[PDB]
Write a protein that binds this ligand. Sequence first.
Ligand SMILES: *[C@@H]1O[C@H](CO)[C@@H](O)[C@H](O)[C@H]1NC(C)=O
Ligand SMILES: *[C@@H]1O[C@H](CO)[C@@H](O)[C@H](O)[C@H]1NC(C)=O
Ligand SMILES: *[C@@H]1O[C@H](CO)[C@@H](O)[C@H](O)[C@H]1NC(C)=O
Lengths: 51, 209, 56, 50, 50
Amino acid sequence: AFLTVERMESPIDSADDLAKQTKIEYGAVEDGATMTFFKKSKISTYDKMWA
Amino acid sequence: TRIVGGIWWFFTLIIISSYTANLAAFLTVERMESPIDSADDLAKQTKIEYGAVEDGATMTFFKKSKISTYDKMWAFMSSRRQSVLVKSNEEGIQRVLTSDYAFLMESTTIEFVTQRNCNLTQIGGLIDSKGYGVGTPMGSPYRDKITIAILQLQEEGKLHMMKEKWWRGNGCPEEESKEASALGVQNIGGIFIVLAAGLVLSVFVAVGE
Amino acid sequence: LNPLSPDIWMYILLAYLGVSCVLFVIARFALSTRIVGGIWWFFTLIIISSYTANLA
Amino acid sequence: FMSSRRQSVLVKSNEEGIQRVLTSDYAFLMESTTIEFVTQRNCNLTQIGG
Amino acid sequence: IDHKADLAVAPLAITYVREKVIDFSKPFMTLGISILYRKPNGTNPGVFSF
Ligand SMILES: *[C@@H]1O[C@H](CO)[C@@H](O)[C@H](O)[C@H]1NC(C)=O
Ligand SMILES: *[C@@H]1O[C@H](CO)[C@@H](O)[C@H](O)[C@H]1NC(C)=O
Ligand SMILES: *[C@@H]1O[C@H](CO)[C@@H](O)[C@H](O)[C@H]1NC(C)=O
């Protein structure tokens, strides 16, 4: 179980892998052209990022 | 000699426990990930390249598509026309061959290409509503004649052979379609080889003395 | 039996029969027996490990 | 989506929709009361939605 | 546009706008757009898979 927990998460966590996971915290300037493209322009993983 | 026997017992138990745990972890992580992409669904990925040709028939169909399984794809490929969008069908096929890319034309073209080269795969099909037939600019009767001739052509058996001989090409090698979770022959043969080598060396050193 | 293919089952059966036959030959004909027992134990360890992993 | 795929799985009635469900990976969309009525009458079916 | 050729034999995906401008005949073939991808590549760990 420990090994599956540590391996199901993506160690390289490239782009879309960050959307599904929630353990790692992430963010940027609030509405500083970062999530302005994410509130609109619905893209699946980008929509998860906006959410 | 009870303490050493017990500690050896626990040693073997914990080592085999770690071996089983790590191997099981590898199997679960590889099986949980779908070996193929989601059937006719490139969504929720946004990492593997996907799209079609620029301003093709598929582009026309999915540009005016508001379904979330398709509108997000359309928006992304319109935003990234410089990278994920190609000009010609063969260009997209080559892009798929060189690197991970998803390409979207008529099923007949895809199957023709995969018969001409077994390096690219096909997953879904008939995700678009269309039909192929002869054309007639006006409301003529000869189009009706052609349609009734075609319909009487399907009712008799000739279409299958002529249809397939066009797409036959080279013989398609037999490849699995319903593989199960059982381990492969090469996946288990290593322990057989190791056991056989150990046994033959043991027999040789026993008969030598 | 999902973790093992029928051919894998045949391989396991032939390995078991070979181990039994070589043990009988050794009996009819201790370090060599110790090595044989150890390698057979390890064989069981890896095969059960693969079985557990796949069905898990 | 259904407009984009009209009459593709649009059954004429439940008396063919149930067989369409039982013959493939087909999901039905009907009023509730009939749905649990069918599930009680015919097994292998449950109202997945609430 | 000049109606030079009364017929055009080719794979003609009969879209709604195309049907509006050219009243096409009944589709000889029923087909649809399909997905393309690279064949899976097996990087096996060899006979010593363990
Ligand atoms: C796939 O491509 C490789 C080189 O990229 C080539 O060696 C191989 O023959 C190709 N496979 C088929 C089935 O054409
Ligand atoms: C489950 O039922 C569906 C619909 O009849 C069928 O296609 C599928 O093969 C069945 N699977 C199993 C494991 O019974
Ligand atoms: C193709 O094979 C390469 C091996 O270099 C591998 O890295 C890649 O993931 C494979 N791609 C597919 C789609 O199987």
